[PDB]
Design an enzyme around this catalytic site. Sequence first.
Site, PDB file in Angstrom:
ATOM      1  N   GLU A  98       0.825  -1.207   0.000  1.00 56.63           N
ATOM      2  CA  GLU A  98       0.000   0.000   0.000  1.00 56.63           C
ATOM      3  C   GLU A  98       0.862   1.261   0.000  1.00 56.63           C
ATOM      4  O   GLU A  98       0.744   2.131   0.862  1.00 56.63           O
ATOM      5  CB  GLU A  98      -0.965   0.000   1.186  1.00 56.63           C
ATOM      6  CG  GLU A  98      -2.053  -1.051   1.123  1.00 56.63           C
ATOM      7  CD  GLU A  98      -3.164  -0.684   0.166  1.00 56.63           C
ATOM      8  OE1 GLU A  98      -3.213   0.482  -0.276  1.00 56.63           O
ATOM      9  OE2 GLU A  98      -3.996  -1.562  -0.142  1.00 56.63           O
ATOM     10  N   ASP A  99       1.751   1.333  -0.990  1.00 52.98           N
ATOM     11  CA  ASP A  99       2.635   2.465  -1.258  1.00 52.98           C
ATOM     12  C   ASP A  99       3.726   2.649  -0.215  1.00 52.98           C
ATOM     13  O   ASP A  99       4.436   3.655  -0.256  1.00 52.98           O
ATOM     14  CB  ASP A  99       1.861   3.776  -1.404  1.00 52.98           C
ATOM     15  CG  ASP A  99       0.752   3.677  -2.415  1.00 52.98           C
ATOM     16  OD1 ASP A  99       0.891   2.875  -3.359  1.00 52.98           O
ATOM     17  OD2 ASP A  99      -0.258   4.396  -2.272  1.00 52.98           O
ATOM     18  N   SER A 100       3.887   1.721   0.716  1.00 54.14           N
ATOM     19  CA  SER A 100       5.031   1.795   1.606  1.00 54.14           C
ATOM     20  C   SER A 100       6.303   1.411   0.858  1.00 54.14           C
ATOM     21  O   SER A 100       6.267   0.848  -0.238  1.00 54.14           O
ATOM     22  CB  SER A 100       4.835   0.889   2.817  1.00 54.14           C
ATOM     23  OG  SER A 100       3.998   1.498   3.777  1.00 54.14           O
TER      24      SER A 100
END
Lengths: 69, 115, 262, 45, 49
Positions: E3-5
Amino acid sequence: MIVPVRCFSCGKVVGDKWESYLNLLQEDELDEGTALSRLGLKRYCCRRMILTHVDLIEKFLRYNPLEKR
Amino acid sequence: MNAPDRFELFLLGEGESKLKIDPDTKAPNAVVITFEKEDHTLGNLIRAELLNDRKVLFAAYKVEHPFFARFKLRIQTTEGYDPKDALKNACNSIINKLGALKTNFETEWNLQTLA
Amino acid sequence: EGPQVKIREASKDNVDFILSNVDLAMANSLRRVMIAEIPTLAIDSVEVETNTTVLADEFIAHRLGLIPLQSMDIEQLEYSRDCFCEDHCDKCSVVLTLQAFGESESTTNVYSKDLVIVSNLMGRNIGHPIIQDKEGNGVLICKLRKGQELKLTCVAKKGIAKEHAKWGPAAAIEFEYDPWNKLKHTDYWYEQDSAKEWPQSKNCEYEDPPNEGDPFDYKAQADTFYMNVESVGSIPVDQVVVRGIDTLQKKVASILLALTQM
Amino acid sequence: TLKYICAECSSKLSLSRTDAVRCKDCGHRILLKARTKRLVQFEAR
Amino acid sequence: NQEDSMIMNQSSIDRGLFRSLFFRSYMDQEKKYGMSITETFEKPQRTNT
Ligand SMILES: [Zn+2]
Ligand SMILES: [Zn+2]
Ligand SMILES: [Zn+2]
């Protein structure tokens, strides 16, 4: 600003290869790739460490010192 | 701000020990050993050497959280074989192999002339 | 009897060898220890006296902390955490001093050859910054315009790469096994042909190519690891390998010691 | 007293509370306080 | 890194990757509240402040 001491990824010391790199570029008219290979930078991590550096410190040195002795 | 000190990765804190052993009730003759201030470097080595043993029915390890440097190693052996004895044998075998490797590397390096 | 080693290339800063008759876990643990667990000397504390340069004090402190120092006899030094002194003494630290002045009309380069050891080394072989280039000047630490001055003192303590990467002596470590993919530990991504699109490793010359008609060998394990260790310069690369093995053996011995004592 | 540096002359001056903030060498009205004498500690990490 | 980490290399950070300097400036004036009510830059004392 000034040449980093070590390559970020692997940690090879590259802070002593900046003046040699500039001398190879200027005096010998070598292209960047051959000059990088001559200094021993074989992995592209070190190659991007030295190739993409911007020596801004020269600009900083142009201004007169604030505290001059 | 909230970043922990880096020496917490390898230095034992106050009031805690390197190893703690707790019996496992899920299966007979099984233990769980918590290693503190250790990581995969030791865990994988110990697990593989335990699996090399013939009387070890089960051997596994896990690092429950990357934030904390500790891991849990579950060992289950056959009846009449102490899991601590299995751990001792695995550690002894690892030490012997590493000593032999160091000796061999030293002998091989002594044969060089272009170093 | 045990793990067998054959070395291909030996240099001042590189050793390329083969590690046969050994488990994959042992080879990977040795690699990880060489990366992280080898003690080394590096500048840890910086007292800045005068800095009229264009760089910030902590910038120069960081650069100094990244300077590789001689650590051949680092085992004779003690960690600062378990020494009886107050902050730093001669049994657990080496004191250097960098004093530079811009008395030239052109820019004056502050290298690491200007670092001067002040504390009495007591005959050890630690402290000296590592010089590698032919010119003799070390790492370019700073630059000075005329009239600019930089006076500072450094305390160097022993440390390992786990606490900070500046203590890592191992640079990049090449590690490969099974160049022909006979163990089928990888599934090669490809468009038309996997063999054509994936360049053959230089180690493929040291193993027999598969016959392409034989059945998959399900009993075969992984061994014969081709490893190339590079040295930053703090300790010779052979000493890097030997001290990695020693540190791993020490870790396992400490596990045994704790088990017996509890 | 307390030490300052002219922002242009880069010369050192000593100023009291009643002194007007100027550089006696040139007359510049911008002054920078001198570096402290107490030691400063930096972690090289 | 879901999740975009992202996962950043800690060793790379230790060697200077993406390290930054941050400067902040505070400005302060003394103002003439009156003919002789000028403010004064000084070290306040708990006895008379
Ligand atoms: Zn690199
Ligand atoms: Zn001490
Ligand atoms: Zn002036």
